[model samples]
Structures are given as structure tokens and as C-alpha cells.
Target: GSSGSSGIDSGLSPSVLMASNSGRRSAPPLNLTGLPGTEKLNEKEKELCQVVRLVPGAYLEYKSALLNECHKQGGLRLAQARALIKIDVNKTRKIYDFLIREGYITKA
Candidate 1:
């Protein structure tokens, strides 16, 4: 009894992986985007994005950190984000809430 990458990979396949991830990213932006289909994107997502910039301290760093986390991990972590940023008086909550509410990203 044995398993190997070429045999019992013990993991999901690439196509299914793609199919699953496809919805995760698009689902949010599409609903959040509201199908505006603009060369320039705006509305709620943009505002939240700008607010990320408006905040102080970890703005520049966590901005990329959070985004990259989303991109690579395939989901956004509300808790960790605020945990890492934790600037002041629920500020991270404000930012996380907007992104969560607007569907910019999903919890899972």
C-alpha cells in the first residue's frame, strides 16, 4: 500500500481546482461591480479601496499584503487582516466590513 504524486495524489485535480476558484473571485467582483463593465472600475469597491489608502500606518503595507493574500490564498481573511493592520478604533473593521459587505471578497 503506497501513494505518490503520480498515483494517489491525495488532492483535487487542476480542472476542478480551476472551476472551484473561478466562482470565488468572480462572484464577488461581479456582484460588487454590478456589471458596470467599465475600463475604469468604481462604485463601492473603489471607495473601499480608496479608504484603504486613506487609513494611516499599515495602509501601504497591508494594502498589498491583504490583496496578495486574497490573490494567492483564494479568499480574504477578515480576522487576520484587522489583526495585522489593527491601526485604531475599529478602523480595520470599517475596511473589512466594506469589503465583506460589498462582495469584494468572500469569507471562505
Candidate 2:
């Protein structure tokens, strides 16, 4: 009785499709326990590290961007780096703090 389009995509409801799409777009889980220097992080710093680590690509991208900005500006500050990256300041601030603690970036 049914024609074609019998696969998973065709069978999924609109809500299911949206949920799956958003899930795919979300960052994967991070395992921060074994990462070096994490043992010294305070609770807030650790939480920030978790957030940054979950999006490994963005972490690296921001680090690289900060390095480039440092070269161009002669030194990079957290506020400038955050502005350059164009992400939420709260998240950027946490990530910047974590990066500094981890020796990924130096203060200006």
C-alpha cells in the first residue's frame, strides 16, 4: 500500500528530526580527568575547562586565533581575544582563564 520513502529519515517526526539535528550539531563529551594540570584547577576553573574541552575544535581555533592576534598586536589580552573570537564573553572569559592556567596563552 505504501509507495517509497520507507527509511529512517522519512519515518521520523518533525520534532524527532529537530532533536536529532541539534544533537548532531552539539559538541561531543569530553574526558578531562587525565588531562595534564587539571589536578590543580579550582572548581570554577575545572568547570570552565570542561566546557572548553567539550568543543576541542573551538578551543584549538581560539588558541590559534589568539596567537595570531598576539603576533599582530604585539601582545594579546583576554578581552581582545574574546572580541576577535566573537563568542559569548562569559564563555570566552572562562576559556581564556583556563588557557592561561594551562600555558596555552600568556597574559599581555
Candidate 3:
């Protein structure tokens, strides 16, 4: 007599479970053009919005830090700037890629 395998498996492989748990699909890019509320943005605020648009999860905080950094002495590096806005350091590359694709920042 031997123990038998349970037949309750959903047929999904462990790799599928790992992929689902690893990360979520990102939201579609935001449309900042011709929006009603955007009319009130000053030039600096508009620029900040362009950068923050990629980070939908923490839009307001990113906007604040980008605007603040714009006035700071040396300007902000991506890692330090995201840290200032309290974004997780591990997500830096994802955000950078989004920003670059959106033309908010250059590869430099």
C-alpha cells in the first residue's frame, strides 16, 4: 500500500504561479494632452506631470518630488529622486523604462 497523489491540481505549472506573483501588468500610459484639469498647470507643473505620468501608482508623490527637485541645486538622479518620493528602489528600472519610452527623460 502506498500514498497516492491528490487529484486536485488546477493543471497550472509552478512557472505560471511564479509569473503571476512576480509582477502585475502595468497600466496603459496616461493621456496628458487636451485634458480639462491640465489647463491650470504652470510650465513647471506641466513638465513634472510628464515625468510623473509614467508612475500611475504614486503619481502625486512623484509629481511633488520632481517639482521640488527642479528647483534644487544639482537636480535629481533617478534612484535618489524615486527614493525621495518613497517609491520602492527595486522598481527603479521599470519606471525608468516607462519614462524613457514616453519621452519624459532621455537615456542619459
Provide the overall lDDT of each model, using Cα atoms, as 2-decimal numbers: 0.51, 0.62, 0.51
Candidate numbers sorted by lDDT from highest down: 2, 1, 3
**Per-residue lDDT of model 1, residues 1-108, tens digit only:** 675666454575343121222323333322222222221444543554344333222244555666667778757766677665655435666676666676656675
Predicted structure with the largest TM-score when compared to the true one: 2
**Native-referenced Cα lDDT, model 1:** 0.51
In angstroms, the error of model 2 at 36 is: 21
Better of 1 and 2 by TM-score: 2
lDDT of 2 by residue, 1-108 (tens): 668875564665443121222244476546666554555545655565566543433455566677677667555667787797987677688777766777766788
Candidate 1, poorest ten consecutive residues by summed lDDT: 30-39
Report the C-alpha lDDT of model 3 over 66-101, residue by residue, as the tens digit. Answer: 546544554445766567666655555455455556
Candidate 3, after superposition: displacement of residue 93 in Å?
Answer: 3.5
Candidate with best lDDT: 2
| Residue 50 accuracy (lDDT) in model 1 | 44
Give the per-residue Cα lDDT of candidate 1 at 47: 54
